[PDB]
Amino acid sequence: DTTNYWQDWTDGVGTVNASNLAGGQYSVSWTNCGNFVVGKGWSTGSPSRVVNYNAGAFSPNGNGYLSLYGWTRSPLIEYYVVDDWGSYRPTGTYMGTVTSDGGTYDIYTATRVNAPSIDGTQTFTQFWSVRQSKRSIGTNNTITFANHVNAWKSHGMNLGSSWAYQIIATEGYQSSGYANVTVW
Template identity: 50%
Template sequence: MKFSTLVVAAVSAVGALAAPAFNETLLSARGGTPSSEGWHSNFFYSWWTDNQGQATYTNGNGGQYSLNWSGNGNLVGGKGWNPGTSGRVINYSGTYQPNGNSYLAVYGWTRNALIEYYVVESYGSYNPSSAAQKKGTVNCNGANYDILTTWRNNQPSIDGTKTFQQFWSVRNPKKNPGGQISGTVQNWAAPSMAWKEISG
C-alpha cells in the first residue's frame, strides 16, 4: 500500500471527495474560493468545491486554516502532508459548528490499492457510517471506533474516475459538535487528514 496525501481538511460532500474540473465562472458568481492545492507555511493544502454552495477557504499560519460555507453542495479543504505516512499522531483543535450533515475527520487516500478513508471524530445530523458495512470495533487512544467499508463505482478519485473502496472509522460516541473541539488521532491506516463537511 502506497500512501498519497495526508491533509488536515474541512470537507462538505454528499458523494466521493475527489476533485473533478471546476467552473471558474460559477465559482466567481457564487463568491467562493477557487479550487486549488499547493504548499503554505510548510504544509500541503488542498481545497475543492463542486460550486453548489458558497464557501470560503483561507490558509492561516502553520497548520491553521478556516472554512466557512452555506447552502448545499460538496467541498473539502484543509492542511496536512503530501505524501502522508502511517503511524503519524495528529493533534487537532478548533471550532466546529455544523449546520446539517457534516464530518470532522481525518481524511485521505492510498494507492496500490486505491482507497479513500475517513477517521471520523464527530459529525452533524447524519452518521456517515449509516450506509456502510460494519466490520467490527476497535479501541484507540481511549475511544471506540466502528470500522466500516463500502464501494464507490465509477466515481471521481485522486487517479481520475475509478471504482474504489472506502474505509470508515467512526468514533462511538462522537465528540459533541457545536463549538470548541480538540483531540488526537493516531493515523494508522492512511494518508490524509481532513475536516469533512456535508452541508444541506
C-alpha cells in the same frame, strides 16, 4: 512533522469560503454546499503518523464531518477517521471496532461507483473509522493513526502501498456551517 499541505476542493455547488491561515490553521464558512473537502496536513501520508488537532469551532448545519482523511493507491482507497459529525453519522458495512485515543470507533467498508477521486473517475473502496459518540471540540485531540491501520488490517482491510495526501479535513454535504481547526 509540521504541516506542509493545504487542500481546498469543492464541487462548484454552493458557496464555500476557506482560508489558508498561518501554520496548521484553517477556517471555512459554507452556505448550501454540494460536496467539499477542506483541510490541512501532509502531502504524503504515513501509517505511523500521530496527528494532533484542535477545532475552535465545528458548527455544521446538517451533514458535515471532521475527520482524518487521505488516500492510498495500489489499491485506490479513500480513508476516514471520523471524530465529529453533524446531523448524519456515516456508516457502511460494519467490520468491528477499534479503541484508540480514549474512544471506541466502529469500522466500516464501502464502495463508491464511478466517482471523483485523486485519479479521476474511478470505482474504488472506502475504509472508515467512526467514533461511536462525538468527540469534544476545543480540546487538543490526538489520532494515533497506526491503531486504525492495524485494526483495519486485523479486519481484512489493507491500505495501498503508495500514499497520497493525509489531512485533518472538514467535509460538507448539502449543508451550511463554519469550522476553525488547527492541525500539527
